Amino acid sequence: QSIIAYTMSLGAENSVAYSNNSIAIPTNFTISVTTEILPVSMTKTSVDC
Amino acid sequence: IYKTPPIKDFGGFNFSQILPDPSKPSKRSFIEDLLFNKVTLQKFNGLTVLPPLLTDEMIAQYTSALLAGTITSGWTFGAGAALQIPFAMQMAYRFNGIGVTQNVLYENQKLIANQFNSAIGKIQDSLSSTPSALGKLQDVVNQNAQALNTLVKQLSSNFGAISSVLNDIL
Amino acid sequence: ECVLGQSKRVDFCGKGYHLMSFPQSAPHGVVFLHVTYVPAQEKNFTTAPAICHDGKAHFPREGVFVSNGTHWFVTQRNFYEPQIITTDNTFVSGNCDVVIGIVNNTVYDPLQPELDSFKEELDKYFKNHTSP
Amino acid sequence: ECVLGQSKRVDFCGKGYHLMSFPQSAPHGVVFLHVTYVPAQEKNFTTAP
Amino acid sequence: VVIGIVNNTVYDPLQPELDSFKEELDKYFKNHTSP
Ligand SMILES: *[C@@H]1O[C@H](CO)[C@@H](O[C@@H]2O[C@H](CO)[C@@H](O[C@H]3O[C@H](CO)[C@@H](O)[C@H](O)[C@@H]3O)[C@H](O)[C@H]2NC(C)=O)[C@H](O)[C@H]1NC(C)=O
Ligand SMILES: *[C@@H]1O[C@H](CO)[C@@H](O[C@@H]2O[C@H](CO)[C@@H](O[C@H]3O[C@H](CO)[C@@H](O)[C@H](O)[C@@H]3O)[C@H](O)[C@H]2NC(C)=O)[C@H](O)[C@H]1NC(C)=O
Ligand SMILES: *[C@@H]1O[C@H](CO)[C@@H](O[C@@H]2O[C@H](CO)[C@@H](O[C@H]3O[C@H](CO)[C@@H](O)[C@H](O)[C@@H]3O)[C@H](O)[C@H]2NC(C)=O)[C@H](O)[C@H]1NC(C)=O
Ligand SMILES: *[C@@H]1O[C@H](CO[C@@H]2O[C@@H](C)[C@@H](O)[C@@H](O)[C@@H]2O)[C@@H](O[C@@H]2O[C@H](CO)[C@@H](O)[C@H](O)[C@H]2NC(C)=O)[C@H](O)[C@H]1NC(C)=O
Ligand SMILES: *[C@@H]1O[C@H](CO[C@@H]2O[C@@H](C)[C@@H](O)[C@@H](O)[C@@H]2O)[C@@H](O[C@@H]2O[C@H](CO)[C@@H](O)[C@H](O)[C@H]2NC(C)=O)[C@H](O)[C@H]1NC(C)=O
Ligand SMILES: *[C@@H]1O[C@H](CO)[C@@H](O[C@@H]2O[C@H](CO)[C@@H](O)[C@H](O)[C@H]2NC(C)=O)[C@H](O)[C@H]1NC(C)=O
Ligand SMILES: *[C@@H]1O[C@H](CO)[C@@H](O[C@@H]2O[C@H](CO)[C@@H](O)[C@H](O)[C@H]2NC(C)=O)[C@H](O)[C@H]1NC(C)=O
Ligand SMILES: *[C@@H]1O[C@H](CO)[C@@H](O)[C@H](O)[C@H]1NC(C)=O
Ligand SMILES: *[C@@H]1O[C@H](CO)[C@@H](O)[C@H](O)[C@H]1NC(C)=O
Ligand SMILES: *[C@@H]1O[C@H](CO)[C@@H](O)[C@H](O)[C@H]1NC(C)=O
Ligand SMILES: *[C@@H]1O[C@H](CO)[C@@H](O)[C@H](O)[C@H]1NC(C)=O
């Protein structure tokens, strides 16, 4: 293992096949849970001059 | 990152002004070439400018994916697996979000087609004629330069000393 | 909004179609558990903008017309649920001479099967009445 | 919210009834092209509740 | 109870779907008299 430098990849390339009479309709689904974190306060502090 | 198909049979619309132009050295379209020309923009005393992480060509590649996806797939690619729907039914769904029935579009397909194409052309003319259209961005670049320039001007102030040249008083 | 009700602003309460969330406390903060519904594997089909049957252009009340290459039906936008083409699921609007790219299919109405049973029922009653 | 989908909030994504938007890059910014439906000339009538 | 209400006839699409059948049945009854 070593350190290397390169150009970043904008993501995984993927093309879509457009047409004027083609449609895709899902037949299944999954229920995934995603977390989310937000700060709401800080430690209050008072100082005497 | 999606990419548009080579075919441009989008039901009488043309997205030419917004679809990227391969001719330019950078993959930029007609509209954002006007914007890059409108805006007007290492130093001795420590003042350095650092380059952004995303190079200016890299951003233009993202906007193509955001634009290619929304012109062939609808709203699905943002909230699931990408699915293809012809553009003629893409507009029909949008009208249902307005509360007008979907028959109106297929009854007047030509009129909406012409009005959309004509409207896009006006934006290129309106932006390129009046110079005050980009006031919001132009404020940011001017504000940054002015404050930084004043800092250099401050080195010539005496601040009540005998001379503003540090080596001179020494 | 995300918790006390259901949200429609896409990608605000969870990535995908949102259902609800369950808040949890934290030291000097708060953490959410968004529950998102996202479609699984897909399948390509043949689609149409409308159906003309007797000179009139037909349109689904909600969803989209769909064909697998042999027959046309109507299903919901986000889940494959085949249904027979019914007029109760398809209103009519004017003639079909302007719909660009229009295709052909017969249109069924759940009115006919009710009439078909009684029409056949009426046929036998008249045949019986010939005996006297 | 109104590029990956359609917005029902009034005035939030352009004056009038909204259909979609198109993003375009810019130096240190972004410019939006809101395509908004707007009702044309009207006509008076008589109504009953 | 409703204010501002006015009178107007109301069309019922399923009625001609049965009126035509009843009309055609009544014709059959007249036809059934001849034999
Ligand atoms: C596309 O969808 C069509 C609608 O479902 C489908 O037609 C249906 O096909 C099934 C078989 O897959 C038939 O089911 C019957 O098949 C034989 C026919 O005699 C019977 O013995 C069986 O017991 C069974 O009931 C349906 O009858 C048929 N429906 C119609 C209206 O024709 C196509 O097959 C689908 N095509 C593909 C490629 O999947
Ligand atoms: C969907 O089915 C419709 C009915 O089968 C069909 O309309 C029919 O089209 C044929 C031929 O296109 C017409 O036949 C006449 O066509 C031309 C005039 O356009 C004449 O020169 C021919 O000699 C012939 O008489 C029918 O008149 C016409 N019927 C009606 C009621 O309009 C549609 O074309 C079909 N649509 C698709 C996309 O296949
Ligand atoms: C819609 O049709 C209704 C029925 O055809 C009609 O209601 C009728 O109104 C008249 C006018 O008042 C009534 O006539 C009687 O009115 C009072 C009682 O309301 C009596 O004291 C009088 O002597 C007179 O005979 C009818 O009795 C009444 N019929 C019914 C069934 O309600 C409405 O008026 C029509 N709508 C409008 C806007 O006119
Ligand atoms: C649904 O189909 C599309 C393309 O339609 C295909 O066209 C014919 C070749 C015939 O085979 C039809 O039955 C097909 O439906 C698929 O897009 C292609 O996907 C493959 C990989 O799966 C890819 O190699 C091709 O390049 C794609 N086509 C184009 C024009 O780029 C699509 O993948 C199919 N749906 C699914 C879920 O696989
Ligand atoms: C629809 O009509 C209104 C006014 O109602 C009419 O009033 C009388 C003139 C009589 O004809 C009634 O039967 C009508 O119902 C119009 O409002 C007027 O607009 C003009 C300017 O266009 C203005 O000068 C008037 O003052 C307005 N009327 C009032 C009472 O203020 C309205 O414009 C008509 N609809 C359209 C699309 O023109
Ligand atoms: C939809 O997908 C789910 C999983 O995402 C499928 O459930 C699995 O089905 C396989 C059958 O091969 C089982 O072995 C797994 O144990 C199932 N998973 C769970 C969590 O129970 C489901 O069958 C799919 N349904 C359809 C109609 O495609
Ligand atoms: C798509 O529409 C656009 C605008 O309505 C068309 O753009 C012009 O087309 C003419 C015809 O060749 C050219 O001379 C102009 O130079 C084009 N404009 C620009 C800014 O280059 C375009 O031709 C249409 N494309 C199709 C296939 O119809
Ligand atoms: C779809 O496009 C092809 C060629 O681009 C064309 O031949 C075909 O007629 C189009 N479909 C419809 C329904 O018009
Ligand atoms: C005709 O109807 C009567 C009862 O109404 C029944 O008894 C008789 O069997 C019927 N005729 C035939 C041929 O079924
Ligand atoms: C509407 O208002 C007028 C006067 O402002 C009144 O005469 C009339 O009765 C009202 N309409 C109804 C249905 O009551
Ligand atoms: C009248 O009834 C006879 C059966 O007795 C039937 O054959 C004939 O078609 C009927 N008339 C008409 C006009 O259908």
Side-chain angles (χ1 to χ4, degrees), chain D residues 27-46:
Chain D
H28 309 294
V30 69
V31 61
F32 278 99
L33 268 62
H34 293 293
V35 175
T36 67
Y37 174 109
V38 171
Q41 55 80 23
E42 50 270 17
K43 184 143 201 293
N44 46 37
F45 293 94
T46 296

Side-chain angles (χ1 to χ4, degrees), chain A residues 20-43, chain C residues 28-41 43-47 64 66 75 79-80:
Chain A
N20 56 35
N21 64 345
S22 68
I23 196 169
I25 297 175
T27 56
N28 206 3
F29 51 88
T30 187
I31 294 90
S32 180
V33 292
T34 59
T35 63
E36 169 157 42
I37 301 102
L38 303 173
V40 71
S41 165
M42 65 182 72
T43 61
Chain C
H28 293 318
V30 70
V31 60
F32 286 83
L33 305 181
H34 296 299
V35 174
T36 65
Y37 156 86
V38 61
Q41 59 84 29
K43 186 191 263 151
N44 48 27
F45 287 94
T46 296
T47 186
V64 63
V66 64
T75 62
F79 188 83
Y80 182 69

Side-chain angles (χ1 to χ4, degrees), chain C residues 55-108:
Chain C
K56 279 76 67 178
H58 300 73
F59 310 83
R61 294 196 100 110
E62 62 275 51
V64 63
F65 280 143
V66 64
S67 182
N68 61 352
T70 69
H71 313 76
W72 290 97
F73 307 100
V74 54
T75 62
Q76 311 107 219
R77 212 162 304 135
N78 284 47
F79 188 83
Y80 182 69
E81 181 56 340
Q83 304 213 310
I84 301 308
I85 183 64
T86 77
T87 304
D88 294 347
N89 218 343
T90 300
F91 66 96
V92 74
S93 292
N95 46 3
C96 71
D97 292 18
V98 71
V99 176
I100 291 166
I102 191 164
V103 300
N104 267 321
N105 188 6
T106 178
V107 170
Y108 158 81

